[PDB]
């Protein structure tokens with residue numbers, strides 16, 4: 001795939017996640033376990049991922065192939081599902097972002 005064409009294809013799905021308010025707010029920066037008061041976080045979550053890390057990777061040609069991008073998005077959600085209780089605000093927000101991403105990524109990958 002062409003970098004600019006791969007970037008262009010996937011772009012709208014990322015922007016879809018950013019457009020969700022307030023659901024995208026806990027996902028815009030890397031989790032800071034000190035600030036958030038969750039000192040066990042890095043013991044439980046061994047490979048953190050967030051929107052800003054994805055965007056920087058996308059925009060700088062780090063994704064040579066779509067599933068690399070998809071795997072990073074999926075990791076972000078699975079991290080939050082793993083760490084947070086199912087009744088928590090962040091967990092509910094996560095499911096919302098995940099539902100949105102599936103409905104966006106299907107028609108994209110059904111062409112690339």
Ligand SMILES: CC(=O)n1cc(-c2c(C)[nH][nH]c2=O)c2ccccc21
Nearest residue numbers: 025026027031036038080083084090
């Ligand atoms: C992604 C993730 O697991 N988390 C995100 C937050 C968070 C809140 C509630 N406000 N701003 C944030 O970044 C968070 C808080 C506690 C545990 C996990 C959290």
